[PDB]
Design a protein around this ligand. Structure first.
Ligand SMILES: Nc1nc2c(ncn2[C@@H]2O[C@H](COP(=O)(O)OP(=O)(O)CP(=O)(O)O)[C@@H](O)[C@H]2O)c(=O)[nH]1
Ligand code: MET
Ligand SMILES: [Mg+2]
Lengths: 470, 267
RNA sequence: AGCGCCGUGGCGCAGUGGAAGCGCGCAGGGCUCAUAACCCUGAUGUCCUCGGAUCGAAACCGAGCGGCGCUACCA
């Protein structure tokens, strides 16, 4: 006669709960899968790529259980501009007797260390191998900077293909090539529709998907039949994530940095402002451990235009108040994931798509803002995303001086003008400020068929610096 | 016992605009009662009834309802009225509609007063309503200032003081309006520290709230902060909220940020 | 989540501080040899819940039901 909530409570108590992180742990010995780290933070960022109207948030929800908002009335149904997120934990059964394929089970972040095994007949307990964060990416042809920024964030890929539709989906190929651009090679192919399609169509679609990916950079990509609503073949997904995808080399030997993609103003309506919260910027830490209590500044920050037309860049110093990750406020931040940094940054600064694609650095470093950048660029032979009805997919043209091109340096979305075009090198003038940290793998897109279309890749080799104003 | 007309003299005047309750229609129109002056009747004539052609006689009259009216020649011997409905200007109808409702409310209150005191309305209007209409031009404005300022009854001789007490109670209960003056201030800051500045601004804006007027800047968004005030005299909320805006500016100009006004204080 | 807006007689509008509203609908009747036009009368309301002052409240207000416009997804 025990209520379900008290049952979940005794499960949480028996599972060990969620222990608080130590205030100052020895950071030399902390590996990304330590109990102090992995029980309360995701360490690998997995992103879903696919064509529109195929279902990516639903798949992650079936994996994890955390919903991806889907806000803004009009965007409740069609497409979402900003990235959708969900927390997932990979729990593996410790009992060897139960079959390996169903040992894996993906749970919400609200779960404990050692939850009971839900298979009928198994008293054993699960072990949390790793927490994984899910950076969902828009899969539409208009929103192109967002998916490139998400790819700059994410570390593992899940490609989504429909079964009953046409095999050579161009949006998926564009996404796959975009991931190929930035030194990311772990992609898992996931067939969304398996219930509504036949047995021989299954082999036909398998063969088509195999034939598509033969000459691209990724060669050994696994394929898995999944279903977003039937809630099946989820354990094998976690198995593939565990086995195929390792942790890229990332430690604390590197200087701290941040890359903010989403802005969040914490201003609860109706309640008195005497009890208010700060401004939260959603940023990935690709390098450097962060802790409660720091001085940090965004480099481009305030972008003002004077009476003479010159652009003045005021970096925005801010004292971080908290580092929200997973479910609980943490004391140390584990790099290699999106954490919500809540700081004293003015709430209006975090309201709209203002902190979208912007680099941030802790005090003790000086990232450099650039206004004219020298890039080295390489192109593909054909455009990706165009549906020519049976004729020679649009061939890529060579660049022209004084044209606007969307030059996505990591997460930044910049419309640059071209100054000089060489065979491999070019110079870009940016009215929207951009910053340089080390190399910053860049993506390039242009405009022919209205909406932006990817063309190739670029890497910064030089630039013209603008000193931040104190 | 309803009697005792609204304005100075019992009979209508030259080119005055009134309103009529209609009851009866014989041949040439309707000789029907007034409820702007005493309770006398008047001729509404068909050639001077409606703008359009008189196609129907039953529809446009609406026995037992309120209608516009103008008197041409007042029979100041016996109590007859020659009255019109067509020649009232389109802007004139609505301004008389006011005057008429203006007159009605004072009677509605003093009716209750008489019926509870069983004093005929004539004495009450003699003692109270007429001096008020003389002093302030309208007994309604006199009642409104009575709500605000007590000295309106000074110089007046009520037939009894309990009349004043119950009239004041009924006017504070029924003629009660505190208009909500509201404004919105846009925080356009991009600066270093903004939430601490906002908390300081809210405290400095809320400590200024008086006993009678309390100002609470409520939150509905990050840039847009909402300023709500209950102006008791419809003229103090403006200065309160202007002081609030000046204090917001004093806050914002030095931390590093900038704010702008979207809507100033409006009733 | 909050700020402004609202509450049919079937519908859209109107007064709402004195008790059931207009016009369009529907029914019936009149005019015409006959129809539409025109002219009369109707039969339809818990004018959204709980309450209040008041001889009075759909109406004036408040502790809420429902849906819009707005800020807008507010970790
Ligand atoms: N029959 C079937 N329908 C599915 C499956 N997966 C998703 N859908 C449907 O796809 C529709 C779109 O869902 P949604 O996840 O919001 O699309 P989206 O991926 O966010 C749009 P974009 O790809 O551009 O980001 C849903 O109605 C869902 O029922 C599936 O496996 N089978
Ligand atoms: C983008 S992952 C979630 C970010 C932030 N910790 C909230 O919750
Ligand atoms: Mg989405």
């Amino acid at each position: 006669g025990e209520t379900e909530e008290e049952k979940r409570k005794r499960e949480f108590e028996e599972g060990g709960g969620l222990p608080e992180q130590p205030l100052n742990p020895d950071f030399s010995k902390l590996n990304p899968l330590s109990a102090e780290i992995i029980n309360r933070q995701a360490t690998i960022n997995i992103g879903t790529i696919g064509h529109v109207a195929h279902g990516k948030s639903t798949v992650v929800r079936a994996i994890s259980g955390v919903q991806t908002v889907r806000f803004k009335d009009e965007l409740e149904r069609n497409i979402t501009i900003k990235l959708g997120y969900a927390n997932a934990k990979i729990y593996k059964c410790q009992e060897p007797t139960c079959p390996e394929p169903d040992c894996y089970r993906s749970f919400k972040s609200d779960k404990e260390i050692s939850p009971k095994c839900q298979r009928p007949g198994c008293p054993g307990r699960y072990k949390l191998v790793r927490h994984v964060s899910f950076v969902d990416c828009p899969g539409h042809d208009i929103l192109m900077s967002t998916m490139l920024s998400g790819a700059a964030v994410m570390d593992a890929a899940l490609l989504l293909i429909a079964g009953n539709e046409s095999c050579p989906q161009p949006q998926t190929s564009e996404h796959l090539a975009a991931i190929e651009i930035m030194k990311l090679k772990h992609v898992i192919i996931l067939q969304n529709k398996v219930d509504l399609m036949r047995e021989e169509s299954a082999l036909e679609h398998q063969k088509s998907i195999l034939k598509f990916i033969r000459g691209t950079i990724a060669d050994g990509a696994p394929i898995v039949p999944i279903s977003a609503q039937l809630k099946y073949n989820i354990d094998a997904v976690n198995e593939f994530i565990v086995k195929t995808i390792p942790v890229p080399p990332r430690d604390f030997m590197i200087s701290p940095r941040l890359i903010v993609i989403r802005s969040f103003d914490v201003n609860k309506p109706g309640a008195e402002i005497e009890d208010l919260k700060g401004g939260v910027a959603g940023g990935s830490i690709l390098n450097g451990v962060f802790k409660l209590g720091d001085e940090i500044e965004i480099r481009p920050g305030i972008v003002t235009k004077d009476d003479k037309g010159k652009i003045q860049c005021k970096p925005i110093f801010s004292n971080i108040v908290s580092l929200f990750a997973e479910q609980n406020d943490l004391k140390f931040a584990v790099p290699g994931g999106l954490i919500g940094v809540g700081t004293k940054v003015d709430p209006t600064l975090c309201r709209a798509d203002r902190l979208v694609g912007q680099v941030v650095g802790a005090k003790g470093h000086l990232p450099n803002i650039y206004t004219d950048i020298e890039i080295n660029y390489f192109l593909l032979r054909r455009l990706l995303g165009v549906k020519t009805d049976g004729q020679k997919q649009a061939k890529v043209r060579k660049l022209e001086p004084n044209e606007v091109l969307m030059v996505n340096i990591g997460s930044t979305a910049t419309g640059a003008r071209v100054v000089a075009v060489k065979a491999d090198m070019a110079r870009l003038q940016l009215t929207s400020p951009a910053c340089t940290e080390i190399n910053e793998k860049i993506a390039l897109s242009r405009r022919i068929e209205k909406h932006w279309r990817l063309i190739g890749w670029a890497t910064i080799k030089k630039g013209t610096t603008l000193e931040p104003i104190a | 016992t309803s009697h005792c007309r609204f304005y100075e003299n019992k009979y209508p005047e030259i080119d005055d605009i009134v309103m009529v309750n209609v009851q009866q229609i014989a041949e040439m129109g309707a000789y029907v009662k007034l409820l702007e002056y005493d309770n006398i009747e008047g001729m509404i004539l068909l050639s001077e009834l409606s703008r359009r052609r008189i196609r129907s006689i039953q529809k446009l009259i609406r026995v037992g309802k309120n209608d516009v009216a103008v008197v041409l020649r007042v029979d100041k011997e016996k109590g007859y009225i020659d009255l019109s409905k067509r020649r009232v200007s389109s802007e004139d109808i609505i301004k008389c509609e006011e005057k008429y409702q203006k007159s009605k409310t004072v009677h509605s209150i003093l009716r209750y007063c008489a019926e509870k005191f069983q004093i005929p309305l004539e004495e009450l209007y003699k003692t109270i309503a007429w001096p008020l209409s003389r002093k302030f031009g309208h007994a309604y404005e006199a009642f409104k200032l009575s709500i605000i300022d007590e000295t309106v009854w000074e110089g007046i001789e009520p037939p009894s003081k309990d009349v004043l007490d119950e009239l004041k109670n009924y006017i504070s209960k029924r003629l009660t309006p505190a208009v909500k003056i509201r404004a919105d201030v846009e925080v356009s800051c991009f600066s270093y520290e903004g939430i601490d500045a906002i908390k300081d601004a809210l405290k400095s804006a809320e400590d200024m709230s008086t006993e009678q007027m309390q100002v609470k800047v409520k939150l509905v968004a990050a840039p847009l902060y909402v300023l709500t005030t209950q102006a008791l005299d419809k003229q103090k909320g403006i200065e309160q909220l202007e002081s609030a805006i000046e204090k917001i500016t004093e806050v914002i100009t030095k931390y590093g940020g900038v704010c702008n006004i979207t809507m100033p204080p409006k009733a």
